[PDB]
RNA sequence: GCGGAGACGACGGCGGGGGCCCCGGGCAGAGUUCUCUUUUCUUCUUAACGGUCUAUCACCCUGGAAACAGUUUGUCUGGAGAUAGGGUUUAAUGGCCGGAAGAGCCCGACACUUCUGUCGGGUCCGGUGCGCUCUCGACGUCCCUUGAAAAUCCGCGGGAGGGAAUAAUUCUCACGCCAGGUCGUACUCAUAACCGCAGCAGGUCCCCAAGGUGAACAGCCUCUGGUUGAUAGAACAAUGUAGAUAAGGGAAGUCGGCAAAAUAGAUCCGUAACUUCGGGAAAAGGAUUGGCUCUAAGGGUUGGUAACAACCAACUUAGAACUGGUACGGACAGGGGGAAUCUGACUGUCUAAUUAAAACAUAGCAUU
RNA sequence: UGAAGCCAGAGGAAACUCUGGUGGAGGCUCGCAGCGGUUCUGACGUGCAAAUCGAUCGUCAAAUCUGAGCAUGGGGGCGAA
């Protein structure tokens, strides 16, 4: 979780309050990163992640 | 009545048909036209994201069985 | 039209069993369009899905039988199936009787009707099964008082 | 001595000539039982009409609005109005009679 | 959750920088008003009877701290 | 069971990723001899042996 | 250095608490309504965590007990200090408050294509127990049986070092600040998700466990919650498998009363030989059992020989009249009994898949 | 069903005896589950089953039933044999 939040902060400049992680049945790790209330997840997903 | 096996549905849960109610009142001998039962009887980023949610549940994104072949024939 | 998913979701939403879920048979296509719990809740609010009431289990016969047994009916030898001790234990009867007698003796000693030596010997008589009930103990105390008063008047 | 007041509001069916208020009042007079016996009202329960298809009850005993609603449903069953008329409490001690919901077919 | 029995201590609790939020709950069936302040560790509840003291406390509270009245239904 | 080790879960993940039919573009290759997945596994038929 | 916690068997009755079950009133809703039924049913809930007040043992002070007393269902305690009076303390799944009514639940009126709802009214007061389940406490019983360890946490004995003058502190107090990585988490757990070659009538470890009858987690019927899945339609021959009845006789049947029938619950009368005196024994043989209407006994609290009245509560037991009858443990459930012989002391154990026994073991005894 | 221990009453110089209670012992007993596997011209016999099904039966507070971890390995082990 520490590496995940560091990677998000250094690459995409994203601040997170907490991160929950699981490992999927196919063998890859999935991270739910909750963002700080000042930043908007919809705005970040539209601009940086391109998830619109 | 079938109260041994199951309870009766309450009368407030079933919409009473106007034809049947008018027929029953006509049996009881009242003027339904004088009371008018017809009047009483009833009868952007966020948008793109919502569309993406709807399409995501409706249609699978990939098809590993058939993405390697294109063309109908 | 298959409505198994809708019946399961409606049971979860209404907080009942699936056998208490009622789906409107004249609205099957509109119920089939409901794939989410929000849509099921909307149909519940519209009244297309309702929770059926519980089937009757009345206690009226049990209560009348209880009143009859209280006033004394159905207590005969043809009605009894367990032994007398299995029905009412002698140990329970004895414990109740001993507690009643000891409570009465404590009350009389506290009020001052009997003194401490008389209390002690009556306690041991009650433990030795002289008195079968409170009236018997009271009458024994009264006859002992009469004998003591006669002895005092003679002396 | 405490006094309780009850209103049975049959204004809409009484105006619609569905509900007979005088017959309902007679039914209440012959069916309200005091101490487990009918015809024992006296000065404890008074039943009257305040007009506009409404029946008013003064009680000095512990007479229940649930009992009044039960007797009203019994009268509707006797008059073949149980499947069509509903007794709904609207205030403290006020029960109105109204039609069930009707759909255009 | 902790109960404050007295309005002045409620006021310096609201004056403290840990005081995150503040709300007013009215119970008309019981005839009482609860003032609640949410801080870092605890939620403090002050219970008052129906008086002028509740409305006077409402302006006597710090103005930077947001004071909100509790609605009848807690919507999510 | 629900309680499982990381090694077990990793090998089950590999088995889940292997459990698929062959892609349909495989059969159109020149000189192709693969007609189906001959190592297909099912949870009721053959055990993984873990 | 010393000590405490972690940290400990089985079984029996008794008491406290929670939950469930039961009864009454009230609000709201529902169902029944030929007739009766102020009716029958449904919601009426309150978490972790805190504050405060309480909760048996145990211990302390005074005092000195035989005419021995206190006291348990169960006989223990007391000049090694009882009763009594006065106190200190461990123990909450107890009361009130905060959480918290704003939640959850029930009902209602409008609005409502969806989007959405919007606004009201409630969520109250008691009682009962040889009930069921869990938990806690004080007791008691049994052993040629005496029923884990460690991590970890705390207390004490000791007295080493140590002082502060624009602050010292070797304070387990309050508030304030920061942080909590890895891996598992779906679903089945079985008449279809496991093993038996299978979607196999087999086998495979646990937790929760409602109402009625009844002694009863027996059998039978019902609620919640689940199912309605096991190739189907028609006909009703023989012979089968399963379930039954049969006049008169009553073991004449058969190697052999095999199988079936008969007995059976409870209350009461009564019960032989033999015996290791514990048993035999439910020996044997008899009387009875429904319904209804009553009567009597068995408790608690309050009130001034009160040795009396009132009120409250629930289940047992005995007695009597009346009444239907072919039946009354009316289904269900549920010993046939007896006279002897051989044999092994008994309880127990084994030939998984043909032998459960006079075999094996056992305690007792004897020898090396 | 009712062993020790205990209480009361009646005797007995006492030791003891009798009567009525209390108490809750036992590799005790009827019996639900569980465990086992007695009997039946039983069912089944290319079965539902390479040992199953029905009724009946034994035992049921312990020499009872049972999970997991661990130990004993073929000239062996284990064996109420």
Q: Where are the beta strands (DSSP E) in B2-64?
A: 16-17
Using a CB–CB cutoff of 8 Å, tell me whether A40 touches chain B.
no
Q: Do D18 and B25 touch (CB under 8 A)?
A: yes
Which of C53, C54, C55 shows the shortest C-beta gap to B5?
C55
Tell me the sheet residues that pair with D91.
Answer: D94
Distance between CA atoms of residues D19 and B71, nearest Å = 75
- Within a 10 A sphere around the Cβ of C31, how many other Cβ atoms? 21
B36 touches chain F (CB under 8 A): no
Report the alpha-carbon distance of residue B72 to residue B59 in Å, rounded: 20
B64 touches chain A (CB under 8 A): no
Closest CA to E44 of E35, E54, E53: E35
Which residues, at least 6 apart from F32, have a Cβ–Cβ distance to it below 8 Å? F26
Cα–Cα distance, D103 to B49 (Å, whole number): 40
The answer to whether the CB of C69 falls within 8 A of the CB of C87 is no
Q: State how far residue B21 is from chain A, nearest Cα, in angstroms.
A: 55
d(CA D104, CA A2): 64
Residue of chain A whose Cα is closest to the Cα of B44: A52
Q: Do C52 and B3 touch (CB under 8 A)?
A: no
Give the nearest nucleotide to C83, CA to C1'.
G266
CA pair distance C100, C94, nearest whole angstrom: 10
Which of C14, C12, C7, C18 minimizes the C-alpha distance to C45?
C14
Q: How far apart are CA B65 and CA C82, in angstroms?
A: 74
Q: What 3 state SS string does chain E have? A: CEEECCHHHHHHHHHCCCCCEEEEEEECCCCEEEEEEECCCCEEEEEEECCHHHHHHHHHCCCCCCEEECCCCCCC
Residue of F nearest to A27 (CA): F13
Cα F17 versus chain centre, distance: 6
Distance from C-alpha of B51 to C-alpha of B61, rounded to nearest angstrom? 14
D65 CB and strand G closer than 7 A = yes
Rounded to a whole number of angstroms, the CA Rg of chain D reads 14
Among F20, F21, F24, whose Cβ lies nearest the Cβ of B69?
F24
Please indicate if any CB of chain D lies within 8 Å of the CB of B30. Answer: yes
Q: Which of these, D8, D20, D21, lies nearest to D91 by C-alpha position? A: D8
At residue A33, the 3 state secondary structure works out as strand
Contact B52 A43 (CB under 8 A): no
* CA gap D10, D52 in Å, rounded: 8
Residue C44 in tokens: 């519940």
DSSP state letter for A48: I
Burial class (CB in 10 A: 0-12, 13-18, 19+), B1: exposed
Q: Please, are residues C69 and C75 in contact by the beta-carbon 8 Å criterion?
A: yes
How was this structure determined? It was done by cryo-EM
Distance from chain centroid for Cα F25: 18
Chain B residue with CA closest to C36: the answer is B57
Interface check for B62 against chain F (CB to CB < 8 A): the answer is no
- The β-bridge partners of E47 are E34
Query: Which among C47, C54, C56 has the least Cβ separation from residue B13?
Result: C47
The experimental resolution of this structure, in angstroms, equals 2.6
Taking CB atoms and an 8 Å cutoff, what residues of chain D touch B25? 18, 84
Long-range CB contacts (< 8 A, 24+ apart) of A27-36? Answer: A27/F9, A27/F10, A27/F13, A27/F14, A27/F17, A31/A1, A31/A4, A33/A4, A33/A5, A33/A8
Question: Is C44 within 8 Å of C13 (Cβ atoms)?
Answer: yes
- D105, B19 in Cβ contact below 8 A? yes
- SS3 label, residue F17: helix
Residues C27 and C2 sit within 8 Å (Cβ to Cβ): no
Q: At what angle do helices E52-60 and E7-15 cross, to 10 degrees?
A: 20
* E36 within 8 A of E25, measured Cβ to Cβ: yes
- Do the bridges between strand C49-51 and strand E21-27 make them parallel or antiparallel, or are there none, so unpaired? unpaired
């Amino acid at each position: 979780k520490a590496q995940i939040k560091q990677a998000l902060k250094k690459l995409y400049d994203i601040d997170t309050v907490k991160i929950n992680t699981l490992i999927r049945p196919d063998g890859t790790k999935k991270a739910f990163a909750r963002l700080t209330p000042d930043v908007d997840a919809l705005d970040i997903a539209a601009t940086k992640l391109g998830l619109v | 009545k079938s109260l041994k096996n199951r309870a009766i549905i309450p009368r407030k849960a079933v919409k009473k048909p106007l034809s049947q109610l008018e027929d029953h009142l006509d049996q009881l001998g009242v003027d339904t036209e004088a009371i008018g039962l017809r009047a009483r009887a009833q009868t952007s980023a966020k948008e793109r994201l919502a569309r993406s949610r709807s399409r995501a549940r409706s249609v699978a994104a990939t098809n590993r069985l058939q993405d390697g072949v294109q063309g109908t024939t | 039209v298959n409505l198994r998913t809708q019946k399961r979701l409606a049971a979860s939403v209404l907080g009942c069993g699936e056998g208490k879920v009622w789906l409107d048979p004249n609205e099957v296509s509109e119920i089939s369009n409901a794939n989410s719990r929000q849509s099921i809740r909307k149909l519940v609010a519209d009244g297309l899905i309702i929770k059926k009431p519980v089937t009757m289990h009345s206690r009226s016969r049990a209560r009348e039988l209880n009143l009859a047994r209280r006033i004394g009916r159905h207590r005969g030898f043809g009605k009894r199936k367990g032994t007398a001790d299995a029905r009412m234990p002698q140990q329970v009867l004895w414990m109740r009787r001993q507690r009643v007698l000891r409570r009465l003796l404590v009350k009389y000693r506290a009020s001052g009707k009997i003194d401490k030596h008389l209390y002690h010997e009556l306690y041991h008589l009650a433990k030795g099964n002289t008195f079968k009930h409170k009236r018997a103990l009271v009458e024994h105390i009264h006859r002992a008082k009469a004998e003591k008063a006669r002895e005092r008047q003679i002396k | 001595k405490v006094t309780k007041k009850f209103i049975i509001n049959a204004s809409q069916p009484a105006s619609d000539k569905i509900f007979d208020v005088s017959a309902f009042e007679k039914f209440l007079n012959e069916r309200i039982k005091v101490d487990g016996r009918v015809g024992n009202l006296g000065d404890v329960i008074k039943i009257s009409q305040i007009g506009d298809g409404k029946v008013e009850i003064i009680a000095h005993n512990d007479l229940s609005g649930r009992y009044l609603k039960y007797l009203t449903k019994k009268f509707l069953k006797k008059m073949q109005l149980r499947d069509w008329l509903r007794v709904v409490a609207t205030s403290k001690g006020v029960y109105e009679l109204k039609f069930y919901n009707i759909v255009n077919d | 959750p902790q109960e404050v029995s007295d309005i002045k201590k409620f006021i310096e609790i609201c004056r403290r920088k840990d005081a995150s939020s503040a709300r007013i709950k009215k119970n008309p069936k019981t005839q009482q008003i609860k003032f609640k302040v949410r801080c870092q560790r605890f939620l403090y509840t002050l219970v008052l009877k129906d008086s002028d003291k509740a409305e006077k406390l409402k302006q006597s509270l710090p103005p930077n701290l947001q004071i909100k009245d509790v609605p009848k239904r807690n919507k999510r | 069971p629900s309680h499982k080790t990381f090694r077990i879960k990793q090998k089950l993940a590999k088995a889940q990723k292997q459990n698929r039919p062959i892609p349909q573009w495989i059969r159109l290759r020149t000189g192709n001899t693969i007609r189906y997945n001959a190592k297909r596994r099912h949870w009721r038929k053959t055990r993984l042996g873990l």
